Write a protein that binds this ligand. Structure first.
Ligand SMILES: CNC(=O)C[C@H](NC(=O)[C@@H]1CCC[C@H]1NC(=O)c1n[nH]c2c1CCCC2)c1ccccc1OC
Length: 128
C-alpha cells in the first residue's frame, strides 16, 4: 500500500506527463489516506481545470480554503477557474488575493500572478 505522500508525488509526476485523470485519481487516493492536507485538493483542482471540469475545480479550491485560508495556490487556481467561467470580477479579486498572500508569505513566483491578473483584467475589459 502506497503512502499518502507517495501518492501525491505519483500524482505530481503524472501531472508533469499531462496524464490529468490519472493524476487526479492519485490525489484522490492521497485524500483517502489523509483528508486534512489542503495541497491534495489544490493539486486535484488543477487537474480538474486541465480537464475543463470547472465546477469540480471550484469545489476542490473550496475544500482547500476551508483547511488553509492562507493558501496562495487555492486562491490562484480559484481565480483562474473563475476567469475561464467568465466570472471576471470574482477571478480578479482571487488573483489579487493570491498576489497579496504571496507577498506576505515572501514567496517568489516572478511575474506569474501579475501576468494572470493582466490577462483577467483585459478579458473583463474586452467584454465591457
Ligand atoms: C502554477 N502551477 C502549479 O502550481 C503547478 C505545480 N507547480 C509547482 O508546485 C511548482 C514547483 C515549485 C514551485 C511551484 N510553483 C508554484 O506553486 C507556482 N508558480 N506560479 C504560481 C504558483 C502558485 C500560485 C501562484 C502562481 C506542479 C508541478 C509539478 C507537478 C504538479 C504540480 O501541481 C499539481
Amino acid at each position: 500500500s502506497p503512502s499518502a505522500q507517495e501518492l501525491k508525488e505519483q500524482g505530481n509526476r503524472l501531472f508533469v506527463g499531462r496524464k490529468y485523470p490519472e493524476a487526479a485519481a492519485c490525489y484522490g487516493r492521497a485524500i483517502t489516506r489523509n483528508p486534512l492536507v489542503a495541497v491534495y485538493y489544490t493539486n486535484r483542482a488543477l487537474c480538474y481545470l486541465k480537464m475543463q471540469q470547472h465546477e469540480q475545480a471550484l469545489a476542490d479550491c473550496r475544500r482547500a480554503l476551508e483547511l488553509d485560508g492562507q493558501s496562495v495556490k487555492a486562491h490562484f487556481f480559484l481565480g483562474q477557474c473563475q476567469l475561464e467561467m467568465e466570472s471576471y470580477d470574482e477571478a480578479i479579486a482571487n488573483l489579487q488575493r493570491a498576489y497579496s498572500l504571496a507577498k506576505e508569505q515572501r514567496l517568489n513566483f516572478g511575474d506569474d500572478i501579475p501576468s494572470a491578473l493582466r490577462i483577467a483584467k483585459k478579458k473583463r475589459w474586452n467584454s465591457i
